[PDB]
Ligand binder design. Structure first.
Ligand SMILES: [Ca+2]
Ligand SMILES: [Ca+2]
Ligand SMILES: [Ca+2]
Ligand SMILES: [Ca+2]
Ligand SMILES: [Ca+2]
Ligand SMILES: [Ca+2]
Lengths: 162, 167
């Protein structure tokens, strides 16, 4: 791990920045790992609001990304290195989502634009879905799948998301 | 033709002379009456509204849209800042946002949400920000509130679609 951390710390400054974390990562493509995802992950582990991670926080970041990669690999059952619609259907089977909705999700998080989902966009869409579903559940106390909300509640709800 | 004096404004802002005003260039050119830099999120949104090339920036031809847009906001802002103190308070905010028919206390929620100076008033950049977000969120709400009683009822998947429209 130590050895891995120094390698990522390009300028040897003892703190891994966004840029540095991004260049250590591959989305399986010719494009950069999504800088929005790099930053969500860093702010999860950085406790001194400094847009960076030191070694002990980096052990947390690295475990987390490697665990996501394990998930990605588990469901990419043709080893194509992209999650296609039916693989996503497997991956999200615990959400009880319709076929039509998986297309919407792909449209939304697929940055490559070919109707498949790369590792970075996989992480992004999974975390967004998860955050949103939890916020939804705060309203759906009777777990019937429907909510009824006033204009003011709705706004506050969006203010709580983003 | 066309416009000589806007060109000067453009070059001052375009410090690197790349021919494109970036996010940071625009932010450094803009003032909020404060020592904290102009809301970077507000800057990015304005750039996104006028950029037709997806280059994270605006060229001269788009910048005349930017100049007009920011200037129009200055006028709306100076209009509701009735005492010309350079911040908008609850009382002023209530006047600005009449047409929304928002409850009294919701105004405090808006102030907390968007005032980054933490004094209970809203500077010019944070004012644009909340108004942009309010109008955008409201149009999305109106789409779902076909009858306009102020209520929506959505499924989980509809809820997710609606949030995807916004985020
Ligand atoms: Ca470093
Ligand atoms: Ca696959
Ligand atoms: Ca319910
Ligand atoms: Ca420039
Ligand atoms: Ca005032
Ligand atoms: Ca309604």
């Amino acid at each position: 791990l130590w050895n891995v951390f120094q390698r990522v710390d390009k300028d040897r400054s003892g703190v891994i920045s966004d840029t540095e974390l991004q260049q250590a990562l591959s989305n399986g493509t010719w494009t950069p790992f999504n800088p929005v995802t790099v930053r969500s992950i860093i702010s999860m582990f950085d406790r001194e609001n400094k847009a960076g991670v030191n070694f002990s926080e980096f052990t947390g970041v690295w475990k987390y990304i490697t665990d996501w990669q394990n998930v990605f690999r588990t469901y990419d059952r043709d080893n194509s290195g992209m999650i296609d619609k039916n693989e996503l259907k497997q991956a999200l089977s615990g959400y009880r989502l319709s076929d039509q909705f998986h297309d919407i999700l792909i449209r939304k998080f697929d940055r490559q634009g070919r109707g498949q989902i790369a590792f970075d966009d996989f992480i992004q869409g999974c975390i967004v879905l998860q955050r949103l579903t939890d916020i939804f559940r705060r309203y759906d106390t009777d777990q019937d799948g429907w909510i009824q909300v006033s204009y003011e509640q709705y706004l506050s709800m969006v203010f709580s998301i983003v």
